[PDB]
Amino acid sequence: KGALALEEKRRLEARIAQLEEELEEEQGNTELINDRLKKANLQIDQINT
Amino acid sequence: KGALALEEKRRLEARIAQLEEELEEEQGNTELINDRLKKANLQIDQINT
């Protein structure tokens, strides 16, 4: 049963890698969404002027 | 080894848990940046018209 903790901990490591992988995937998606915000924010300051 | 194996999960549990907050940052950005676009798009659409 004690070894199961290592297996469970090792299995949790796979989810940890997915968390880091999702962060990279989300970072690119968040950066893409941020680009639209920059263009939209610039329009709120450029079109308004 | 058994006691250390169970304690090893606590180390990864805090990392896997603390990593959730890091992943939530990108997750929240998809909801915060997108939410800001709705408020910006609403003003940009009104300014365009």
Add this chain to the structure above:
Amino acid sequence: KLSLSTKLKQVEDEKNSFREQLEEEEEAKHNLEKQIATLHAQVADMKKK
């Protein structure tokens, strides 16, 4: 507790049965030993007679 109590009672009943059986066997040798003394005395008496 029930297994130990039942096993203890079962072993106690078996030991108790041996006590009653031992009394019959212990007393059986007495009648046999007394018969040997009486038979040997009669054999010796009959032999001398």
Add this chain to the structure above:
Amino acid sequence: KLSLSTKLKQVEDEKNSFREQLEEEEEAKHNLEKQIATLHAQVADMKKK
């Protein structure tokens, strides 16, 4: 359970030790019966003689 466990093994020794006496008592009875048969036969043999 400690008293029952100790008594369980204790009663087992008594039932086993007493059981050994049954074999000795039974064997002693058979030995006495064998001598009784020879003594009884000698009595009848000496009586008829």
Add this chain to the structure above:
Amino acid sequence: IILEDQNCKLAKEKKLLEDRIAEFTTNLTEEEEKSKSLAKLKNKHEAMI
């Protein structure tokens, strides 16, 4: 004899303790992620505010 009863009792307790630990340790993983995820959720409102 006393050690046998004590060792047998500790054996069953150790087996049940390890089994019950998994029932509670498993919930800690979900609570750890939920608790940590909720922490970043509060920061999302602060950043959005």
Add this chain to the structure above:
Amino acid sequence: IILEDQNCKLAKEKKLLEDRIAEFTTNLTEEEEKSKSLAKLKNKHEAMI
């Protein structure tokens, strides 16, 4: 000594599991306290946001 050695090492497991189960159970509830505490505080940000 051999029997006591096993019981000595096995006794630590029952004591460690009994002592670890108390900490493991409290650790799982610790996330609920932090999550509930952060959730309550996060509710104020939600009402303000």
